[PDB]
């Protein structure tokens, strides 16, 4: 992961969420009259990570013991009231997921910016579109970048839409009903949710892992797009192609591949049992932080390579001419269809292409060896049809469509 | 799959969308003056599946040949103009995905309806909350049904949000620029999108398999919940438990397992290359129809079992009382906490619990053999504290919260 | 899938395994005196798929009913004795898995044969080795084919080793103990295994899905190699590369991608419960035939493309020269190290390479513009060092190692 | 993971294998006359992990070989790593770690097979209800259940041995697998190093093959799969409403099985590498393999422990067996009466007694005795004996004997 993301899921930050949740709970339950105000005043005072000794099997109760034994007069005996261990972790993860998606939103912003710039800069730079790694028809490199831009924006919408579901609180107690809090449970839950800038929960979700999984599936979709970017780039940076040059993409392949399988594990964890299951919880506890760190590795590399990406229009022009005009045969067909018969127009270029291909000669040269062509049309305009730059299509217009929203 | 969903993705339905797309294109392209007005009239006339010989090998061009060779006066030379094969296939898939989500939305209503009824009907039927298949604390069966209900509503929200991205058109030609349509390309695209009640595409997406993948990951989340439901039922319908009864769930388990792995394939297909690529398309071409029919099988079984679910509160009573009050030991702790110290109360019930556990005797009897207990509290309320039905917490209240929005 | 493999898993063939299994059971149990000789003698007579109404919820009991009701004198009441439905399906699958692996073994022979031919034929054809899609150092195309050959041979060993575990019988009744057969259960089971040329089972495996899953994971490894091959080919057949030509590979990508994810489903199906479980079983019932048909599609395409593969040595030479000799800079260093100083040799060619690269000029041209170089050795052999075709290494010998 | 397995894949162990590989290469390459004999003595002497400053470098191997060359006097360190590429060191070192890891797996599997062998015998005759789809089916013994696992864990052991002969191979091919810089001594150096490291020589390079590592991965997937079924059955049998067994931990094995299998899929995906060398596919293996090894060891440790200390309560199995009040052994009653009254007629009649005994929640014996045809053609002493689950156990001790003989 990246130093930014690798600390979000570090212990130091994690147990910080722990102390931040316990303090808010103490405040909430004091205001509701569940615990003494002065005990709460002391619980919160010692909820500072700077004051925790890192002793070397319980992730949360290990902290609340160092907090209970660190409060004067045994006032620390009043924290963690009515809350279960999973409540602290799940809500803490939710807090961490938000911190992570802030970076993702920031990296996505930069990536969309870089793409917007490249789509404009190379708006009209011609190149060969490739289908199954074979050349197809002429397009512009800015058109290629525009197709990515439209994708990352869809991913941006996906991220925003899931935030309103994921940013929920997890405070349901042992069986999700908060028995030991009696009737103050729902009062405490909604109080804590407002305290933590989280949405109140409709009902407990200690075994309903749909929220966390949605994050995984999004990370999988996003990394998937980032992988296509690295594939096209490293393809275009081939020794034999050289249409672009990196300023780092090969790493995105591992991130996306690990992330997609990780998301599948999270979908498996959705098949939890009853009100609590250690197994499924453990799966999320393991994959989710990894998936966050893989995706940040991908976004960072992707952001960098685009910001410093080198584009070589000369190489793109050269590759377009490998076909010696064959690539724009469709243009020659439609162009010549006016002077010669439409039926003959197709039948002549089509046959002239086979000749020029088996003979590895320019299409223009085989067209001019047909007498009707050489007689009813001259070289200057016959060449203009065989120019790949003339069959660029209506791309710049599409590029504008993507840059308008 | 189910007969309802297997006809959406049947061959007959597919070639039906093909012919419906070709007709709309002929209309649109005539209206723009791209093709002859009378030629379109005959193209549309032969866009009836009833007129196609199932000689079966090409997916689209096998049909467009039967349409061209079926149009008199050589008018069939004008269909499929400027469109590539994937344009027809993907757009048809988009159409089929919508029909499929029509069924999914309806089954989700039946499933959400059933849960609302069960959440109320069994609102107060008590039962033992289970953590790791071990008993924990008492809750009500209606509380369990609400937790599923609240989830399926989230899945419904997710379904709607992706519809606005999925219901897009795919008409970009060979490289997404619609070269052969010249300056009429974007005009034709938006026209066809309006013709087919689809949103127009910002830019081509022949290798941007994010939309279809979005569908896949959704089916994974949705089936994930349907899988947890089937687990809880068949667990609660165990011979040794018998708390519920089916009217069939075991099949849902396989669906969830296949759909999640299929989704992983779709995320893999997202790493497509350049402008067009067979294979990534093939993965989707195979998985999506398979995944749709598995999910429909799951929704059908889930829908049916819920409408006919047998709930036996007596079994929940029997299993709940097996602990002889141990399950509601926490209640006894808090009760004596008023007369005696709260902390001191807990240390005593736990010790009273060890005895009743080693002696396999009711906790109430072990409470009464401690004299200090019998002196600071009488049998009538110690019986009332050891009653599991009294330590349910604010469940009916949580149940109400899920039933409001 | 392919017509050869797609009929192995067709209904016609499946219920044929059903009817062949039931007959052997009637013979064995009659032979053991469990059922009458004449009932078995007649039950087997009606175990012909041609006599089953294909117009038809239960996969096996639907067939065994057409046999019970089709036997004269009600003699058909003696078939399916003591056996559970899963016994018939699982044993039938095992029989089908064997038939499928027969095709796979043949495809591997053809593919390994083609590779042996290609590795020898193009033993010395030089080409550019590629690392991260960038050129690295010269190797021969036969050397590339040998690396595949060594792998497909490993896959062959894997196939044979699992065969001794997979070709087992599944006859355990309801709980794997064959209660209703009493003490003749083990007698009947072991008899049936020999009847069907299967190994008898140590104990029941109605929920012990290690065998079927192992098949899946092997299919995963095999298609894994087939996928790399298709990628290398289509990379080498790019418009801008043109080192080879297909006679079709893009399908292998989907096959491998489905088979690899399918295998995970089977690994999930291993988490079965207790003595029998629908669902975990269902996963295998669905994935196994699909993965078998994808793998045959991949093997089929791969076998054909290798037999008809076009190799263009001229294109391979052209790509090697793109670097203008830089690709064999390591060769120039070690060669010149004797005439010049070893340390200087490295320090000088290294600097000349940076120049020739930033200047997009031949390395030989920059080497001769160094005065010491031009003075202590002449162009005839300086050209000889810059030739990529001379720095191939021990490829032909390595190729010999793979061909044994 | 476990301290032993968490230590095999620790950095200290990894950089230790690097130095052991570098030393063996220097010895071999001096012995072949490729490098100076005196230079090797300086390379080997400074191949001690105690002499490495843990100044992390973000190159995995060259960060060490730079500290090894710069730590050798007389510029004699210029001769290490000759003709070897970075992946050569990592892959060969990984092979070494896989061997140490598979050493632990073999030991833990022995303990597990031993425990099961003992439980299968001890509880050979302990009756219990076979369960199909979590519903009761017919009576079996706990030893039969434990033996079915035993037969599987033995199969897993055979699989491990078969893959070792392929995995324990060397990785020495240079940049493209041709060992250009070693000239004609390349194949000589490779085969020498393989013997030096007690590894099999490689037929040809495998920098982009990944068939070996994937085989290991899929194996860990199969193994953890079985460990997952075991963890399910125990906690299923330790359920509050069941109580047939008791743990002394199984819920953790469930996550390992789920994580290892999806990791295995990643390793199969990494097989689609390109040409002669490729980062990414290598990275996938670099990340998943150590994770999968430590997940699998965690499972094996928990599984081994719970099996040695598994508490079995035969009374609970008896208690659950009688919940059906004889219906569970209804097939037995049919075959008994099938002799006097006829097989076909017996089932068609006993089934009706089952519907009654169930609808009335009365013992099957009681409804059987109220039918006169039964009461007249069969006596209470054996009608009671037929409805006893312990009498319809079938051949189990024999199957257990079959599994325990090899
Ligand atoms: O640098 C490394 O440790 C390994 C590499 C780099 C590469 O791909 O060139 C590999 O996996 O081959």
How would you characterize this protein structure?
Four copies of one chain form a homotetramer. Chain A is built from 17 helices and four strands. Chain A has 405 residues and is mainly alpha-helical. Chain A folds into three domains: 1-83 and 172-204, Fumarase C, Chain B, domain 1, CATH 1.10.275; 85-168 and 205-318, Fumarase/aspartase (Central domain) (Fumarase C, Chain A, domain 2, Up-down Bundle); 324-403, Ribonucleotide Reductase Protein R1, domain 1, CATH 1.10.40. In chain A, strand 1 (126-131) and strand 2 (134-140) form a beta hairpin. Chain A has a two-stranded antiparallel sheet with strand order 1-2. Chains in contact: A-B, A-C, A-D, B-C, B-D, C-D. Chains A and B meet through strand 1, strand 2, helix 6, helix 8 and helix 9 of A and strand 1, strand 2, helix 6, helix 8 and helix 9 of B. Aconitate ion binds at residues 60, 86-87, 90, 207, 277-279, 282 of chain D.
Topology overview:
4 copies of one chain form a homotetramer.
Chain A: H1 3-8, H2 11-31, H3 37-45, H4 61-68, H5 85-121, E1 126-131, E2 134-140, H6 141-166, H7 185-195, H8 210-236, E3 244-245, H9 250-269, H10 278-307, E4 310-311, H11 313-320, H12 329-336, H13 342-358, H14 363-368, H15 371-376, H16 379-386, H17 395-403
Antiparallel strand pairs in A: 1-2, 3-4
Helix pairs in contact in A: 2-3, 2-5, 2-7, 5-6, 5-10, 6-8, 6-17, 8-9, 8-10, 9-10, 12-13
The structure holds aconitate ion.
Aconitate ion binds next to helix 5 of chain D.
């Amino acid at each position: 992961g990246t130093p930014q993301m690798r600390e979000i899921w570090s212990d130091q930050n994690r147990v910080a969420c722990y102390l931040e949740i316990e303090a808010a709970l103490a405040i909430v339950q004091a205001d509701l009259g569940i615990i003494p105000k002065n005990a709460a005043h002391e619980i919160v005072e010692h909820c500072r990570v700077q004051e925790i000794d890192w002793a070397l099997i319980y992730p949360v109760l290990g902290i609340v013991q160092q907090l209970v034994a660190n409060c004067k007069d045994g006032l620390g005996e009043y924290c963690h009231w009515g809350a279960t261990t999973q409540d602290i972790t799940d809500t803490a993860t939710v807090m961490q997921i938000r911190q992570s998606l802030t970076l993702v939103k920031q990296r996505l912003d930069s990536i969309v910016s870089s793409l917007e710039h490249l789509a404009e800069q190379h708006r009209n730079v011609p190149m060969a579109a490739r289908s199954n790694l074979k050349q197809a028809v002429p397009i512009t490199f800015g058109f290629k970048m525009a197709r990515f831009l439209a994708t990352f924006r869809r991913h941006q919408q996906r991220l925003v839409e899931l935030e309103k579901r994921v940013y929920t609180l997890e405070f349901g107690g042992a069986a999700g009903n908060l028995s030991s809090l009696g009737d103050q449970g729902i009062a405490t839950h909604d109080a804590l949710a407002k305290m933590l800038d989280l949405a109140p929960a409709e009902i407990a979700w200690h075994t309903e892992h749909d929220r966390f999984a949605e994050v995984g599936t999004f990370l999988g979709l996003l990394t998937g797009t980032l992988a296509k970017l690295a594939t096209d780039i490293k393809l275009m940076s081939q020794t034999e192609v050289g249409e672009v040059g990196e300023p780092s993409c090969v790493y995105i392949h591992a991130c996306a591949a690990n992330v997609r399988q990780g998301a599948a594990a999270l979908l498996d964890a959705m098949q939890s049992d009853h009100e609590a299951g250690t197994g499924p919880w453990e799966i999320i506890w393991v994959q989710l932080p990894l998936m966050m760190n893989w995706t940040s590795a991908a976004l960072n590399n992707a952001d960098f390579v685009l910001r410093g990406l080198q584009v070589f229009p000369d190489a793109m022009q050269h590759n377009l001419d490998l076909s010696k005009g064959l690539i724009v045969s469709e243009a020659v067909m439609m162009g010549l269809g006016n002077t010669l018969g439409r039926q003959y127009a197709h039948d002549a270029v089509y046959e002239c292409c086979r000749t020029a291909f088996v003979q590895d000669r320019p299409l223009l040269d085989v067209l001019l060896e047909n007498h009707e062509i050489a007689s009813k049309l001259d070289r200057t305009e016959l060449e203009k049809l065989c120019d790949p730059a003339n069959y660029l299509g209506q791309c710049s217009q599409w590029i504008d469509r993507v840059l308008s929203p």
